[PDB]
Amino acid sequence: DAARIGADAAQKQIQSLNKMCSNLLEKISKEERESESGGLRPNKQTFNPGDTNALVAAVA
């Protein structure tokens, strides 16, 4: 039969609907990838000894 049911809803229409769903999924995946590509780097934070070193106590 090659479709087991229907004539207008045969393998042609099934392949068309599958291609439409695949295009929608690929568009969603591309949007997700473009949204996730914005991540530059895991910029953490820590102490700032560069200023306090010169600002450390002294004879003054």
Binding site: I14, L17, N18, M20, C21, S22, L24, L25, I28, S29, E32, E36, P42, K44
Partner: protein, 105 residues
């Protein structure tokens, strides 16, 4: 304490995200409803698991130089052991005195 539960939840969420991605791909490729929302949720969960893994890997790196937290309160352990031994010896002596008293009466 909380970091262990955090990592466990992150691993469980990564597994659930893999399962959800597989199920969404199956439902979308079976025939052509909620496949779009399923794929969106799967991608979001995968991104969240990746972000959690990156954050856990970007930890403060406590020591990374030598064996840290050296000394697990061994003195207190030995003190507790000696206290238990004292209690046991006192119990043995008390039982001996009780046996002597029972033999007396």
């Amino acid at each position: 304490n909380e970091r262990l539960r955090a990592l466990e939840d992150i691993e469980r969420e990564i597994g659930a995200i893999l399962q959800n991605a597989g199920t969404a791909i199956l439902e979308l490729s079976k025939e052509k409803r909620l496949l779009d929302r399923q794929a969106a949720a799967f991608t979001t969960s995968v991104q969240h698991v990746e972000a959690e893994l990156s954050a856990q890997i970007r930890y403060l790196t406590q020591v990374a130089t030598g064996q840290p937290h050296e000394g697990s309160s061994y003195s207190s352990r030995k003190d507790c052991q000696m206290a238990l031994k004292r209690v046991d010896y006192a119990r043995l002596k008390i039982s001996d005195v009780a046996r002597t008293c029972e033999q007396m009466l």
